[PDB]
Amino acid sequence: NTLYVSQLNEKINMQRLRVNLFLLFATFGEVLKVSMNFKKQRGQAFITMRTIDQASLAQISLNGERFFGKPLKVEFSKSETKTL
Amino acid sequence: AELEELEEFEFKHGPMSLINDAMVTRTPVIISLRNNHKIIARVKAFDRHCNMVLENVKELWTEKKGKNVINRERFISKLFLRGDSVIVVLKTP
Amino acid sequence: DEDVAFEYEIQKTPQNILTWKRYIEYWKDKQIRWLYERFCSQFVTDTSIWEDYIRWESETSRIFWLFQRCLKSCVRDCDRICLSYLELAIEMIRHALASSLMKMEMHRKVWDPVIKFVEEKVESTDEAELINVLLVKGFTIWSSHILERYQQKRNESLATLALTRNITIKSVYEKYLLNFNYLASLEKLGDNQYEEFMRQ
Amino acid sequence: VSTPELKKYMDKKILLNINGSRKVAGILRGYDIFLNVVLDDAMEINNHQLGLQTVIRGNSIISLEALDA
Amino acid sequence: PVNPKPFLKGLVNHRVGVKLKFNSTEYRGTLVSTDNYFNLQLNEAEEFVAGVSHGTLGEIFIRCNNVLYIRE
Amino acid sequence: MKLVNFLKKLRNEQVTIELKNGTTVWGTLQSVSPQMNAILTDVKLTLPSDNIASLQYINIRGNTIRQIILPDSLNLDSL
Amino acid sequence: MKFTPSIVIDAPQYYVDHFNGKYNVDKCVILRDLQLETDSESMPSSLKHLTHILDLTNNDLIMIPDLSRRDDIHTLLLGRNNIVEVDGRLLPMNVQNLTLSNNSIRRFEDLQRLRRAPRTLKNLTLIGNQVCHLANYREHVLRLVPHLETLDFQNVTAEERKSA
Amino acid sequence: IQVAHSSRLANLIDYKLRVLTQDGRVYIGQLMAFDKHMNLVLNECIEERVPKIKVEKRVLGLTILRGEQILSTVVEDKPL
Amino acid sequence: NGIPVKLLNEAQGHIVSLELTTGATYRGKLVESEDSMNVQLRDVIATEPQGAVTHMDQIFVRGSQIKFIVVPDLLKNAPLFK
RNA sequence: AUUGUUACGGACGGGAAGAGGAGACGUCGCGACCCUCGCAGUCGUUCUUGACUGGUCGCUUGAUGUUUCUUCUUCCCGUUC
């Protein structure tokens, strides 16, 4: 379900970044996660989705996609999310 | 019963007596308000906390910016004016 | 116009009485009436729908029409309908009662109530009741029938009273029954013959 | 009915800020449920004295910083 | 010795002076009666808007919440 | 005793009320309380002549409502 | 099927998008894979319920249609659509966060509706289309749509503005 | 805006309501709890200012609102 | 009894911001809570609408004139409701 | 096998230029030479538990509420007749 992003623009703000992420991930499926839990920035963001299929699709399509200068490294999460 | 019942005649003795009288024998009264207002109407009902009901309500107030006096008017009837806004009421002959 | 769109919506797919709602509840009045009635005619023969239609209609003639419509196809809430019919009759009373009975033949209390109208009879409302009674008589008479359908002793008494307004009651008693028979005979008589009947 | 916990602020100087832009100050002597704070000092604001002890009404006491923690 | 309510009582059938916060207007008339919530009723009322009069009203009534004070 | 009682008895009727902000707002009374906590179903608003800036539903508190109008032209209280 | 009022009514308006605002509507049985071939008709059925986040992605919408007040559809997601042209005077101030990814915006002249943005469109993004591949496209966008802050995830800088 | 014909304060618990204050600052928040004075506990408060033209925004509180200065609450949009 | 009051009571030893009638926004620890909403704080910051911000050691606030009291996101569902 | 009710051509707006709006206090944003380095942060004490929580610098004309003082000309773009 969850997809752990990495290698992104740290210079962008938190809320804005979150919004951007939401915008990105709405095409694949319904994004459950509203805000980031880590609060560290610089790539580390867990995009929580409703469906696994959607997540998979996202992983497939947005692997190395241009988001704020740098290519985002998509990958599946190790542990399941608290909401899911 | 008696603690509330004895308070019924307290209107006709104290400062509400005049208003009670007015209510009994409908006559026009000048009602003022907080933010520059002058209302004219005749009395019909009455309660403990000055929440009055009236008839033939003529309103006179101002909504003029920059110190110009403008007296707007409009006919209202059968209101329910709450007691917190009512300052001065008086029975005219 | 906005009606075309509504029509299209109605046509394209059934949304479990959603289209109908859209048609009627938004407008309601004439247009709404046209819609809802049409919808009713088309597909759904529900009780709730019928009730709604009746409400919309709600003059006496219109009410009657609504009642008739309701009666046409109504299996589940028949008893309830019957009450409505009775009420209508009270405001063609006997006739209304009969209609109700036909709709849904449980209904002891209703019967009793109906009878009590007869008892009362024995201003507008009163007039209506009288009219209903007359209608029943013409049909026959109706009150007696109701009593029969319908505590039993009470019903019989009521019937008798109606007849008097007595003969019928007597007859009923006789049917039930020797004493009853005698009573019936007496009623029929109502001098020597009558006395004899009573004795019997 | 319930007593405000002002026993903590006893024998400590307080810089009050009442309604209508007025900074009063004084040491706490007595209190109550209505918040009518009986305090034994009054110096207005720059600074000048106007009477020693001052009892204040409960409605017109909004903010009160304690000087000694 | 002299409390407020008794003072008020004493001041019945005598001249009274009262002022308000909102729209500062001095009301001057002879007092009629009062109640437990301190509402007022005056006779021969003169509505002095900061010295100058608006008009002689006559028999009037006043609510407690607005009133600032009672004087001669 | 009280004239909140009067208000309580009224149900399903349009009434304008002028608030502390100063807007004429016609609406249905709904479940009136002893604290005058009104609730309006359809209403017309003017955010700070009356400019049109209306919303549908609203929940009113009793302290704001100073005047009420147009329930129905009739006076009855005691019962 | 076609975007009707009934469909809208049916739509799941329970789970609110917690990033901003409330009521993240998804028209029909599911707006994601609804297959609305025509333009977004019957917009009045929603009646400006809700950023709103009317996620109308994975559709076949030919043109972007709006019909609401100044605060009714800020975070609109129209991803994976066939958006040819999106000219309109209804959604003037509201639609700021426009997720128009994987669209069918061919030419730079097709963005002339969004262009002259000082009054025409108070805010608009647009990205991931055929027009992005064209020569001097970003610059053109900057020139015309000054309100476009984030241009395909990367921001419109001062230098860029100067250049355009 | 969608909202069903609710009767009382108890039936409309757990809904995103706007709230208006005496000075004229607009609020939004999900109604969590109830009280005698309508001290409605908002789930997340986004306060808004209007100077004495256009509405501003803030994001500080997730508050317990007090009932003294409230004018009239308004329903925004249902959750779930 | 009042649920908000209960909630307030529960949140003792938590970072709670505030706002008054004038609009002076505070942010610090909560000391005590009562039936009447009387709050006392520790290490309390002060960022007023005028401009002159300050850092205060302690403060006590009257309940009637408070506009709203802030609470964190932890005490949302449990353990106050049911 | 509980819930409910009652009673006690002319106008307007925006942007730019020329001639005769500005200063404080805070509150959220566009860039970054910085910090920081990861999937659900820091430290005390003991073999697993208690406490505390986007920052800094530009803006090279970012937004916004208190609080004091005192417009005309030219071009460009939209709406209306």
From Swiss-Prot, chain C:
Ranges for the HAT repeats: 1-28, 29-58, 59-78, 92-120
Superkingdom of this protein's organism: Eukaryota
Subcellular location: Nucleus
Leader sequence segment: none
Protein family per UniProt: Belongs to the crooked-neck family.
Note: Present with 2170 molecules/cell in log phase SD medium.
Oligomeric form and interacting partners: Belongs to the NTC complex (or PRP19-associated complex), composed of at least CEF1, CLF1, ISY1, NTC20, SNT309, SYF1, SYF2, and PRP19.
Protein purpose: Involved in pre-mRNA splicing and cell cycle control. As a component of the NTC complex (or PRP19-associated complex), associates to the spliceosome to mediate conformational rearrangement or to stabilize the structure of the spliceosome after U4 snRNA dissociation, which leads to spliceosome maturation.
Protein name (record): Pre-mRNA-splicing factor SYF1
Organism whose genome encodes this protein: Saccharomyces cerevisiae (strain ATCC 204508 / S288c)
Lineage, highest ranks first: Eukaryota, Fungi, Dikarya, Ascomycota, Saccharomycotina
Gene: SYF1
Full-sequence portion shown in this chain: 21 to 293 of 859
UniProtKB/Swiss-Prot annotation, chain D:
One Pfam family this sequence matches: LSM
Assembly: Component of the Sm core complex, present in spliceosomal snRNP U1, U2, U4/U6 and U5. The core complex contains SMB1, SMD1, SMD2, SMD3, SME1, SMX3 and SMX2 (Sm proteins B, D1, D2, D3, E, F and G, respectively), and is probably a heptameric ring structure. SMX2 specifically interacts with SME1.
Molecular function terms from GO: RNA binding
Domain annotation Sm: ranges: 1-69
Localization: Nucleus; Cytoplasm
Keyword list, A-Z: Cytoplasm, mRNA processing, mRNA splicing, Nucleus, Ribonucleoprotein, RNA-binding, Spliceosome
Any one Gene Ontology BP term: U2-type prespliceosome assembly
SUPFAM superfamilies the record matches: Sm-like ribonucleoproteins
InterPro entries attached to this UniProt entry: Lsm7/SmG-like (IPR044641), LSM_dom_sf (IPR010920), Sm (IPR047575), Sm_dom_euk/arc (IPR001163), Sm_G (IPR034098)
Family according to the record: Belongs to the snRNP Sm proteins family.
Principal location class: nucleus
PROSITE patterns, per database record: SM (PS52002)
Miscellaneous comment: Present with 1400 molecules/cell in log phase SD medium.
Organism name: Saccharomyces cerevisiae (strain ATCC 204508 / S288c)
One CC-aspect GO term: U2 snRNP
Purpose of the protein: Plays a role in pre-mRNA splicing as a core component of the spliceosomal U1, U2, U4 and U5 small nuclear ribonucleoproteins (snRNPs), the building blocks of the spliceosome.
Record protein name field: Small nuclear ribonucleoprotein G
CDD domains registered for this protein in UniProt: Sm_G
Source domain of life: Eukaryota
Curated annotation (Swiss-Prot), chain G:
Chain ranges of the LRRCT domain: 129-164
Lineage: Eukaryota, Fungi, Dikarya, Ascomycota, Saccharomycotina
The keyword Nucleus is annotated on this UniProt entry: yes
Protein species of origin: Saccharomyces cerevisiae (strain ATCC 204508 / S288c)
Residues of the full protein shown: 1 to 167 of 238
Function: Involved in pre-mRNA splicing. Associates to U2 snRNA in a MSL1 dependent manner and is required for normal accumulation of U2 snRNA. Required for the spliceosome assembly and the efficient addition of U2 snRNP onto the pre-mRNA.
Single GO MF descriptor: U2 snRNA binding
Extra remark: Present with 3630 molecules/cell in log phase SD medium.
LRR repeats: 51-71, 72-92, 94-115
Protein name as it appears in the record: U2 small nuclear ribonucleoprotein A'
Assembly notes: Belongs to the CWC complex (or CEF1-associated complex), a spliceosome sub-complex reminiscent of a late-stage spliceosome composed of the U2, U5 and U6 snRNAs and at least BUD13, BUD31, BRR2, CDC40, CEF1, CLF1, CUS1, CWC2, CWC15, CWC21, CWC22, CWC23, CWC24, CWC25, CWC27, ECM2, HSH155, IST3, ISY1, LEA1, MSL1, NTC20, PRP8, PRP9, PRP11, PRP19, PRP21, PRP22, PRP45, PRP46, SLU7, SMB1, SMD1, SMD2, SMD3, SMX2, SMX3, SNT309, SNU114, SPP2, SYF1, SYF2, RSE1 and YJU2. Interacts with MSL1.
Entry GO terms, CC: cytoplasm; nucleus; Prp19 complex; spliceosomal complex; U2 snRNP; U2-type prespliceosome
Keyword Repeat: yes
Subcellular location field: Nucleus
Protein family according to the UniProt entry: Belongs to the U2 small nuclear ribonucleoprotein A family.
GO biological process: mRNA splicing, via spliceosome; U2-type prespliceosome assembly
Highest taxon listed in the record's lineage: Eukaryota
UniProtKB/Swiss-Prot annotation, chain I:
GO biological process: 7-methylguanosine cap hypermethylation; mRNA 5'-splice site recognition; mRNA splicing, via spliceosome; spliceosomal complex assembly; spliceosomal snRNP assembly; U2-type prespliceosome assembly
UniProt subcellular location: Cytoplasm, Cytosol; Nucleus
Cellular component GO terms held in the UniProt record: catalytic step 2 spliceosome; commitment complex; cytoplasm; cytosol; nucleus; precatalytic spliceosome; Prp19 complex; SMN-Sm protein complex
Principal location: cytoplasm
Sm domain residues: 3-75
Record has Cytoplasm as a keyword: yes
UniProt keywords, alphabetically: Cytoplasm, mRNA processing, mRNA splicing, Nucleus, Ribonucleoprotein, RNA-binding
Gene Ontology MF annotations: mRNA binding; RNA binding
Task performed by this protein: Plays a role in pre-mRNA splicing as a core component of the spliceosomal U1, U2, U4 and U5 small nuclear ribonucleoproteins (snRNPs), the building blocks of the spliceosome. Also binds telomerase RNA and is required for its accumulation.
Subunit relationships: Component of the Sm core complex, present in spliceosomal snRNP U1, U2, U4/U6 and U5. The core complex contains SMB1, SMD1, SMD2, SMD3, SME1, SMX3 and SMX2 (Sm proteins B, D1, D2, D3, E, F and G, respectively), and is probably a heptameric ring structure. SMD3 specifically interacts with SMB1.
Family under the similarity heading: Belongs to the snRNP core protein family.
Protein name, per record: Small nuclear ribonucleoprotein Sm D3
Gene: SMD3
Full-length numbering of the shown residues: 4 to 85 of 101
